[PDB]
Design a protein around this ligand. Structure first.
Ligand SMILES: OC[C@H]1O[C@H](O[C@H]2O[C@H](CO)[C@@H](O)[C@H](O)[C@H]2O)[C@H](O)[C@@H](O)[C@@H]1O
Ligand SMILES: OC[C@H]1O[C@H](O[C@H]2O[C@H](CO)[C@@H](O)[C@H](O)[C@H]2O)[C@H](O)[C@@H](O)[C@@H]1O
Ligand SMILES: OC[C@H]1O[C@H](O[C@H]2O[C@H](CO)[C@@H](O)[C@H](O)[C@H]2O)[C@H](O)[C@@H](O)[C@@H]1O
Lengths: 219, 221
């Protein structure tokens, strides 16, 4: 059986730069009678099926923009993207079809861009939720770069650790930023016993946190 | 047009078998191989096996030899994958793919994938909650609204805004599992002058429960 290795596991480039990524096979993929290497490259964007880019190591699939090139032979192969676009955000896999099929581990491509501060929004529990007996407060930290960010929650001025779940988006092709949601869930009875809820965002773009608050009797 | 139509999400109990279809249309079915590929959440593609539908001949990744059985019904242009004695290790998305063996030796058209979850848990549909800001208007050139989709199982759920006609400014967050239920959220950002005047609705689908919910976002008082 054939074993496939890709490197690096990820890499970051700025829009318009060139990137090359590498694939190795445990056995040659060069065919005897043929002059072809049975090696294909695939692009998989978040939430989508893989898409064929190149086959026979170097033939481009129809519709594939000409910025994607494949090269190499035997046990050593390369995929090159000239002038990366933010729409190229994806995992890239090589795959042998010399005997059966084997995918490489993938190379994740990330985009580098200018730092941007988060836009921070806080939201109280809905009255729908409250009739359920539970109560989520949600904070969106949107359209920021780089990815590293800290969020802190306070109730009536006091920090809070349990019941806070966080989730980051994939890097956006539209503007190369990240976003983050933070949800604090409490029981309805604990939520009503307290009056003020605050979410604080610490990002490298500014030395002081961005702070959003709401009060249960604000109107 | 070439299409490979896979079944929707499958919640199955540990120890049982699951059999999933891949219905091919738009080309000569017996001229291409059907390959099957596994992908765990956030992980890489892993090839399972293939069937040559003309002959019925099958080849498997040895790791899957005891797990998978590939078949093909030539009369219905449908390839099937059966997974036996399922465990949590089998929880994944399975793709089928048209595989041009003998020519490109590449997988040129792919199914959308069938999400298999192996669990004893029951199917629970989501509750969908509107996210509208409290009285204090905050930074009021654009306004951010959202939907909280709480308490469902299994994955996946999808979210759109105004049936997909509200596209830009959207952020849909990955689901997190907590105490046996998933939660996710989605935000949308619009000009403050357009809302509440022009409606904003999130449209939530949960295919495992065959449920769809629309939640219009309306201002609080
Ligand atoms: O990672 C490249 C993809 O970026 C966009 O999608 C991500 O960014 C969105 C906005 O924050 C999120 O809602 C989404 O969940 C992320 O996957 C873009 O929409 C995709 O088309 C890109 O392939
Ligand atoms: O040879 C590399 C490893 O291959 C297998 O991994 C497959 O499945 C992983 C997660 O299930 C993917 O992330 C990976 O890309 C695939 O190769 C498996 O991990 C082992 O058999 C091998 O060490
Ligand atoms: O019917 C429109 C097209 O549907 C398929 O393509 C879509 O769905 C595939 C599976 O999710 C994707 O890989 C593809 O990128 C989508 O556009 C079909 O394969 C096409 O031939 C149809 O034109």
């Amino acid at each position: 059986d054939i074993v496939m290795s890709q490197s690096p596991s990820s890499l970051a480039v700025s829009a318009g730069e060139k990137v090359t990524m590498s694939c190795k096979s445990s056995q040659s993929l060069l065919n005897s009678r043929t002059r072809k290497n049975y090696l294909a490259w695939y692009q998989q964007k978040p939430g989508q099926s893989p898409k064929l880019l190149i086959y026979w190591a170097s033939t481009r699939e129809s519709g594939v923009p000409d910025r994607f090139t494949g090269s190499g032979s035997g046990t050593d192969f390369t995929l090159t993207i000239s002038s990366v676009q933010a729409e190229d955000l994806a995992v890239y896999y090589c795959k042998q079809s010399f005997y059966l099929r084997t995918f490489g581990g993938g190379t994740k491509l990330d985009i580098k861009r200018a730092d941007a501060a988060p836009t921070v929004s806080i939201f109280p529990p809905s009255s729908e939720q409250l009739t359920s007996g539970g109560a989520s407060v949600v904070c969106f930290l949107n359209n920021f770069y780089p990815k590293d960010i800290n969020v802190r929650w306070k109730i009536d001025g006091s920090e809070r650790q349990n019941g806070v779940l966080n989730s980051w988006t994939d890097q956006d092709s539209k503007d190369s930023t990240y976003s983050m949601s933070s949800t604090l869930t409490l029981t309805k009875d604990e939520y009503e016993r307290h009056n003020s809820y605050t979410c604080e965002a610490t990002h490298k773009t500014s030395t002081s946190p961005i702070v959003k608050s709401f009060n249960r009797n604000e109107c | 047009q070439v299409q490979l139509q896979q079944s929707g999400p499958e919640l199955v109990k540990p120890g049982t078998s699951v059999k999933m279809p891949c219905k091919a249309s738009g080309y000569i079915f017996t001229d291409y191989v059907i390959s099957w590929v596994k992908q765990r959440t956030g992980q890489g593609l892993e090839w399972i096996g293939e069937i040559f539908p003309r002959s019925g001949s099958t080849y498997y990744n040895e790791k899957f030899k005891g797990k998978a059985t590939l078949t093909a019904d030539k009369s219905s242009n449908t390839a099937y994958m059966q997974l036996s004695s399922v465990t949590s290790e089998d929880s994944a998305v399975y793709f089928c793919a048209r595989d041009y063996y003998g020519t490109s030796f590449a997988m040129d058209y792919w199914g959308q994938g069938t999400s298999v979850t192996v669990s004893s848990a029951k199917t629970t549909p989501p509750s969908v909650y509107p996210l509208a800001p409290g009285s204090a208007a905050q930074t009021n050139s654009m306004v951010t609204l959202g939907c909280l989709v709480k308490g469902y199982f299994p994955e996946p759920v999808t979210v759109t805004w105004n049936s997909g006609s509200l596209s830009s400014g959207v952020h849909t967050f990955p689901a997190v599992l907590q105490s046996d239920l998933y939660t996710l959220s989605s935000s949308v950002t619009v000009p403050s002058s357009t809302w509440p005047s022009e409606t904003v609705t999130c449209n939530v689908a949960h295919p495992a429960s065959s449920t769809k919910v629309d939640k219009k976002i309306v201002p609080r008082d």
